[PDB]
RNA sequence: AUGUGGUUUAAUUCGAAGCAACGCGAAGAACCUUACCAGGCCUUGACAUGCUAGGGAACCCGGGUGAAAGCCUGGGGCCCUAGCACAGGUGCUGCAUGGCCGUCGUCAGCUCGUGCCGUGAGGUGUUGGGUUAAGUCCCGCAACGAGCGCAACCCCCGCCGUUAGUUGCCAGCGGUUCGGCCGGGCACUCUAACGGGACUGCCCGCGAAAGCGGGAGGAAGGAGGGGACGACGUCUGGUCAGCAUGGCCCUUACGGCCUGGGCGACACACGUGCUACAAUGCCCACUACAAAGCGAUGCCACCCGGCAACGGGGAGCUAAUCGCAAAAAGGUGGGCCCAGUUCGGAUUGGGGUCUGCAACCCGACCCCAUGAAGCCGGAAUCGCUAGUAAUCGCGGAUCAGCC
């Protein structure tokens, strides 16, 4: 039951990256959830904009959409060979239980 | 809340209805409760996008400016 | 990254960047791309000679990629080097306002200065160019000079631009005077 | 009014009071901006000032005083 | 904060900047 | 002015446009059932004390509360005359609406945990079968100021 | 309640000053913070590499004076001294500055190229008529086009669909410690990625045109709502007290530690606010709908002791799966009956909880008693054009606690 968590600022950077972890783990293990979406949500930050320090009397406003996919593997065995060295795209963050 | 339940039953029973038959739902979804020109005459239809509204800056409610005086 | 080191993990990578930009300068800095996993970031300088940062033989990328490790340990994590060279440093934003910079702190003619600048990144490529030089021109009243060729119209409007932009300093007897450079190229 | 248990006292005057209690008491007065103390009774007989933001005001303090604060004492507001 | 040592408002995660202003500038380019 | 005219959904028990203009008047915060309620409430009131059904009652009581002419300032050569001028058939109504809710609120009567009552009795005040009350007052009083610099 | 003027004070630290200073820097003043005041204390120096010379040289425990620092000194047993090379100051100057910010102003302008007019500076274009949020567009014209700006391209919110389902729900069936808990199921909510949709496109009216008015459909319109994008510049705008930095000034001190006081004073003046003067109301009870947030010694379920604040005990949560949490206005029933009142809670006496070394000066909370002014506010004056104003409660940052 090896939950992966795949986060990324990008739609796409995402749907390839997690795609790619469906596919690989197909050959040592269950096979996959399939890429669970998890809507996205979008986080509005008012606050300073540099950290204690300089110009503490700024602010602005940011929103950041955060994107999420699951698949999730039960019954893991050699998944973890083909995911380990497997991966590509930077600008995705994956953590896994 | 109660209100706004109130309103989103509004739409379902007005959509449902139209799912049901075309024809019976009519103008502010499909021909008499379906839709219009301009102003909607119930337009049940519709989703009332309005949301509660963010608060701006330099004003205490939002939309709501403070007031001046001689000062 | 992680939650409680995130911001550590953080200070290192300006504690690289640090080192680089003092060491680096003659090299001729234009980004310091940072990526990383665990106990090996990424670090790829980009140059305009990449000659001087690699060394001869690559006598000097060993000392300054020793020197890393020095401050990422094995905590940090060992880090790796590599180097790519600028194709045409006249594209550079960080280059082009480096380069006016410099001649600025020898005493050289800024207007001048400017226009040569953007010349050569009008000459090679790009779009459109402008250079923007701070006060203190010449030592004499804070002024400000210009001088732009092209379109930077289609750029400054946010809408795909991609106007590299660089800003660069210089210290001078006088005082401190920015200089920013802007190049327009194919927008998206 | 009881804040807690163990009555709260900052350590400055207090180390400072008590080290004057052996040679006896301290002449002139001390100063400390801590009115957020309680008076203990070793401070009696002492004769403390207390800061008023503006200034320090001489405060003797007497036994039926000890439960105080101090800053009970030093008033911050003037009629001025 | 870390970087600048404005005291003054630094966010704890960051722990940089020399308060929003750095973490807006560097965030800026 | 301040904006177009905004079309009203007409009432619930008797889909009537003005009534719930009327209502509107009535409301404040926003607490629109409250000023549903009263209403309503003095609907029924009319139906017990007065036999007419409470939405005629209504409708005759705006008639006479809408003022046919109003003074206007206006800077003549020398002082600022008070113009006499029509008032146009919208703005009677605006008038008449909020006369009524005034004066009603102006009852020394509190009867109903709220204003339903002072509204029921200023309703009927009002309806020339009793051209009486406080609103009606307002109205002949502007008519009485026109036509007074005629 | 709060900020300010002023006055007072040992000091009431500093700055901000018409709009654009005054619930402003302060998103957290009891000590701390803290920059002020009182008192105790600490010169090669609080830190760097080093020189000549006399001297005890590692080090450990006391006393005198003191606010502390420091100074003097007793003394078990690398370092001091003399001369030499060489930190700290929120102390001044924002008219020496960087940075950042406020502001006119989200406002409609500023120009170029060629042509044409003028001896020339320059003009024409950019003016005129209609229209627009707009130098927006239309018609006109010795002008024809263009660049920066406007708009658009980007982000968040409104409606629909595809893909994806450990979020979700009996929607739909079987079971239940009847918790969506169990199997199961992706429909729905939702999560996040992409696609559709609005363009005055269609209908009637006026117009030369742009477009104005009106109507239908539609979740939505005629820029649908809010951002990013605040131009060249202006105010010798604001801040050397966030930080940075030129110059000036202080170095037994204009530095540093500490305890205590002060920043919380008041005869008064003003700004911004809270609560209210009541019956469209107040009180008690019962009962119903929300969103966005936060939680490790932290949120605190539930049980117990207390009228209560809160204390004791203790489950789960590591947080769509546990907690903060009760939503308040609202609906239902009762009380009050127009009175300074079952309105209104100031003020004061007493008891007590809690944080914290410590709540006199100077914390918040609970319970009893007290129960003020206030019955709608002079001249004058402020906000807001729709889910806005008005009204109701909920969360957060700072943060031990909290004004």
Redesign the interface.
């Known amino acids: 039951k090896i939950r992966i968590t795949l986060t990324s600022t990008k739609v796409k950077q995402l749907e390839n990256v997690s795609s790619n972890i469906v596919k690989n783990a197909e050959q040592h293990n269950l096979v996959k959830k399939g890429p669970v979406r998890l809507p996205t949500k979008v986080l509005k930050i008012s606050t300073r904009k540099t950290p204690n320090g300089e110009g503490s009397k700024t602010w602005e406003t940011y929103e950041m959409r955060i994107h999420k996919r699951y698949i999730d593997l039960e019954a893991p065995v050699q998944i973890v060979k083909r995911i380990t060295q497997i991966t590509i795209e930077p600008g995705v963050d994956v953590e896994v239980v | 809340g109660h209100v706004s339940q109130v309103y989103a039953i509004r739409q379902a029973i007005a959509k449902g209805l139209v799912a049901y038959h075309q024809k019976y739902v009519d103008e502010q979804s499909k021909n008499e409760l379906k839709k219009a020109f301009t102003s909607y005459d119930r337009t049940l239809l519709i989703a009332d996008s309005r949301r509660p509204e963010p608060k701006k800056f330099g004003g205490k409610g939002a939309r709501s400016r403070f007031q001046k005086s001689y000062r | 990254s992680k939650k409680r080191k995130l911001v550590a993990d953080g200070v290192f990578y300006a504690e690289l960047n640090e080192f680089f930009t003092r060491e680096l300068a003659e090299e001729g800095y234009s980004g310091v791309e940072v990526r990383v996993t665990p106990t090996k970031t990424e670090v790829i300088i980009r140059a305009t000679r990449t000659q001087d940062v690699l060394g001869e033989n690559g006598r000097r990328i060993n000392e300054l990629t020793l020197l890393v490790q020095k401050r990422f340990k094995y905590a940090p994590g060992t880090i790796v080097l590599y180097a790519e060279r600028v194709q045409d440093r006249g594209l550079s934003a960080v280059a082009q306002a480096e380069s006016m910079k410099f001649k600025l702190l020898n005493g050289l003619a800024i207007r001048r200065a400017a226009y040569g600048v953007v010349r050569y990144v009008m000459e090679s490529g790009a779009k459109g160019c402008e250079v923007v030089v701070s006060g203190k021109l010449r030592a004499a009243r804070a002024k400000a000079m210009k001088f732009a060729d092209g379109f930077l119209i289609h750029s400054g409007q946010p809408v795909n631009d991609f106007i590299d932009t660089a800003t660069r300093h210089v210290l001078m007897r006088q005082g401190v005077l920015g200089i920013k450079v802007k190049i327009m190229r194919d927008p998206a | 009014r009881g804040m807690t248990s163990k009555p709260a006292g900052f350590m400055k005057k207090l180390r400072a009071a008590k080290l004057a209690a052996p040679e006896n008491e301290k002449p002139a007065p001390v100063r400390t901006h801590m009115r957020n103390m309680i008076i203990v009774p070793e401070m009696i007989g002492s004769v403390v000032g207390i800061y008023n933001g503006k200034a320090f005001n001489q405060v003797e303090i007497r036994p039926e005083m000890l439960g105080h604060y101090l800053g009970e004492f030093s008033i911050t507001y003037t009629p001025v | ?27 800026n ?1 | 002015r301040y904006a177009n005219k905004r079309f009203r959904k007409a009432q619930c028990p008797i889909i009537e446009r003005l009534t719930n203009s009327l209502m509107m008047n009535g409301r404040n915060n926003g607490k629109k059932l409250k000023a549903v309620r009263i209403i309503k409430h003095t609907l029924d009131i009319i139906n017990v004390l007065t036999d007419q059904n409470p939405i005629q009652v209504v409708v005759d009581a705006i008639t006479n509360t809408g003022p046919r002419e109003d003074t206007t300032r206006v800077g003549g050569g020398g002082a600022a005359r008070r113009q006499a001028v029509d008032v146009s058939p919208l703005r009677r109504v605006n008038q008449a609406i909020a006369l009524l809710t005034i004066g009603a609120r102006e009852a020394a009567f509190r009867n109903i945990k709220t204003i339903a009552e002072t509204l029921a009795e200023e309703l009927i005040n009002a309806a020339k079968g009793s051209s009486t009350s406080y609103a009606i007052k307002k109205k002949d009083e502007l008519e009485r100021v026109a036509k007074s610099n005629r």
């Open positions: 904060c870390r970087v600048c040592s404005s005291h003054t408002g630094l966010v704890r995660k960051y722990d940089l900047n020399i308060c929003r202003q750095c973490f807006r500038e560097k965030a380019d």
